[PDB]
């Protein structure tokens, strides 16, 4: 497979900035979802799940085809809880019917990170909706109950190296695990709808205890009321991952820079950009615009 980026006909930067502003205005507005966490965290989890199905060996999956819109992908056990993110973006797709699904789902993630005071993420347009039979089968997204070798081997399918994997995982400072969605429960820290390097500081500074939860799954729990998945806790059990965790805990700006590069890479895997294509857009936040 080759998936060539094709700009939505007649659209430029100012068009996409209007879709970004519509998602950001609605994030401000529906601030009550999930006990006042808001929809920012479920929207970056949706952009990572529609992107994380990519396989570098045959170029199948990834964000290009917008195939989460199909039942097979929508009902994947690993996507439980993302229906909420889908339902949020649905009025926005009725308002801007010209944008492709892959472009809207991925732009949802970019807008959430920047509006949660995260780094600016460069974003490219050009994903094209593909037919229901290009939908990847279930089972390509990662399990939580595993160790650092599984994590490393998994992320190699999307060709992510150690630094990219540790930077990407800093997003687990956001939102929370939910028992009915995944069999895990709890938040990762206190500031769960503001983007900071909190995931790393908690992993280095809390007194974590391994316990089983009400679903019979193990997780690491701390005195503070926080939790870590086995795959999260993995990052301080592997010596190469631990040096990077320490780096990001001591330097949030380095974390923001590397998260920005890795998250754009993740959202563009599997897509060829022609060099006539527009350069990546950097969108302004509501605040930058006085809105
Ligand atoms: C080995 C990698 C990963 C595994 C096993 C994993 C697993 C999980 C699980 C079990 C949940 C909880 C779902 C729920 O109950 O609602 C979760 C939540 C979340 N994940 Fe991941 N994750 C991984 C990587 C990532 C990455 C790379 C990102 C983003 C760059 C990400 C972003 C999120 C976010 C923001 C949430 C919170 C969503 C909410 O509050 O509803 N995850 N993850
Ligand atoms: C710490 C954590 N792991 C997954 C989600 N969260 C919040």
Residue nearest (by alpha carbon) to ligand 1 atom 38: 42
Residue nearest (by alpha carbon) to ligand 2 atom 6: 172
Q: Give the ligand whose atoms come closest to the C-alpha of residue 241.
A: 1
Do residues 277 and 12 make contact, with C-beta atoms less than 8 angstroms apart?
no
CA separation (Å) from 19 to 37, 210, 250, 281?
Answer: 22, 43, 35, 13
Phi/psi region, residue 290 (left: phi>0; alpha: psi -120 to 50; beta: rest), is: left
Residue nearest (by alpha carbon) to ligand 2 atom 4: 172
Q: Classify domain 1-141+263-291 at the CATH class level.
A: mainly alpha
Residues 6+ apart with CB under 8 A from 128: 3, 5, 6, 64, 65, 100, 102
Could you tell me the residue ranges of all domains in the chain? 1-141+263-291, 142-262
Residues 6+ apart with CB under 8 A from 160: 168, 262, 265, 266
CA separation (Å) from 219 to 177, 214, 227, 234?
Answer: 11, 11, 7, 11
Phi/psi region, residue 95 (left: phi>0; alpha: psi -120 to 50; beta: rest), is: alpha
97's tokens:
């019917």
Alpha carbon of 133 to ligand 1 centroid (Å): 27
- Residue 40 neighbours by CB distance under 10 Å: 27
Nearest atom (ligand 2) to Cα of 192: 7
Do residues 180 and 213 make contact, with C-beta atoms less than 8 angstroms apart?
no
Q: Give the ligand whose atoms come closest to the C-alpha of residue 37.
A: 1
- Resolution of the entry in angstroms: 1.9
Query: Which of 73, 78, 68 lies closest to 101, judged by CA?
Result: 68
Alpha carbon of 40 to ligand 2 centroid (Å): 14
Strand-pairing partners, residue 139, are none
Could you give the residue ranges of the DSSP H alpha helices within the chain? 13-29, 33-36, 40-51, 71-74, 83-95, 101-115, 148-156, 162-169, 179-182, 198-205, 230-237, 239-250, 252-268, 286-289
Residue nearest (by alpha carbon) to ligand 1 atom 6: 144
- With H, G, I as helix, E, B as strand and everything else as coil, classify residue 60: strand
Q: How far, in Å, CA of 134 to CA of 122, rounded?
A: 27
Alpha carbon of 55 to ligand 1 centroid (Å): 19
Spacing of C-alpha 66 from chain mean position:
15
DSSP 101-118: HHHHHHHHHHHHHHHTT-
Encode burial over 2-13: b for 16+ CB neighbours within 10 A, e otherwise.
ebebebbeebee
Give the max Cα distance, the chain. 55
Do residues 196 and 226 make contact, with C-beta atoms less than 8 angstroms apart?
no
Taking the CA atoms of 92, 93, 95 and 100 in sequence, report the sign of the dihedral they define: positive
- Residue 260 neighbours by CB distance under 10 Å: 17
Strand-pairing partners, residue 208, are 222
Alpha carbon of 254 to ligand 2 centroid (Å): 21
* Cα angle for residues 146, 268, 41 (degrees, 5° grid): 55
Alpha carbon of 32 to ligand 2 centroid (Å): 20
Residue with tokens 């944008």: 99
- With H, G, I as helix, E, B as strand and everything else as coil, classify residue 70: coil
Residue with tokens 């609605």: 26
Alpha carbon of 31 to ligand 2 centroid (Å): 20
CA separation (Å) from 12 to 41, 102, 110?
Answer: 28, 17, 17
- Residue 92 neighbours by CB distance under 10 Å: 17
Query: Which of 95, 120, 90 lies closest to 105, judged by CA?
Result: 90
Residue nearest (by alpha carbon) to ligand 2 atom 3: 172
CATH number of 142-262: 1.10.420.10
Calculate the dihedral angle through the C-alpha atoms of 41, 45, 48, 50, rounding to the nearest 10 degrees: -130
SS (H, E, C) 136-172: CCCCCCCCCCCCHHHHHHHHHCCCCCHHHHHHHHHHH
Do residues 125 and 278 make contact, with C-beta atoms less than 8 angstroms apart?
yes
Q: How far, in Å, CA of 22 to CA of 33, rounded?
A: 18
- With H, G, I as helix, E, B as strand and everything else as coil, classify residue 173: helix
Does the C-beta of 43 come closer than 6 Å to ligand 1? no
- Which residues contact ligand 2 via a Cβ below 6 A? 172, 175-177, 187-188, 227-229, 232
Residues 6+ apart with CB under 8 A from 8: 15, 98, 99, 100, 103, 125, 126
Q: How far, in Å, CA of 284 to CA of 53, rounded?
A: 29
């Amino acid at each position: 497979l080759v998936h060539v980026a094709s700009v939505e006909k007649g659209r430029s930067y100012e068009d996409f900035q209007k879709v970004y502003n519509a998602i950001a205005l609605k994030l401000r507005e529906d601030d009550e979802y999930d006990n006042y966490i808001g929809y920012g965290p479920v929207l970056v989890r949706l952009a990572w799940h529609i992107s994380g199905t990519w396989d570098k060996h045959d170029n199948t999956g990834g964000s290009y085809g917008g195939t989460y819109r199909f039942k097979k992908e929508f009902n994947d056990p690993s996507n439980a809880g993302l229906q909420n993110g889908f339902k949020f973006l649905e009025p926005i797709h009725k308002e801007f019917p010209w944008i492709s699904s892959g472009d809207l789902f991925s732009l949802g993630g970019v807008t959430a990170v920047q509006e949660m005071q995260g780094p600016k993420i460069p974003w490219r347009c050009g994903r094209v909706d593909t037919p229901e039979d290009t939908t990847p089968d279930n089972g390509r997204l990662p399990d939580a109950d595993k160790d650092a070798g599984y994590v490393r081997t998994f992320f190699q399918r999307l060709n992510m190296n150690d630094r990219e994997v540790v930077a990407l995982m800093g997003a687990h400072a956001l939102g929370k695990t939910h028992l009915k969605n995944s069999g895990y429960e709890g938040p990762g820290g206190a500031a769960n709808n503001v983007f900071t390097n909190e995931f790393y500081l908690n992993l280095l500074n809390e007194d974590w205890k391994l316990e089983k939860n009400d679903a019979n799954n193990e997780q690491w729990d701390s005195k503070s009321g926080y939790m870590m998945l086995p795959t999260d806790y993995s990052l301080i059990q592997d010596p190469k991952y631990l040096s990077i965790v320490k780096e990001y805990a001591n330097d949030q700006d380095k974390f923001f820079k590397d998260f920005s590069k890795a998250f754009e890479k993740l959202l563009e895997n599997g897509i060829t950009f022609p060099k006539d294509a527009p350069s990546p857009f950097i969108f302004k936040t509501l605040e930058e615009q006085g809105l």
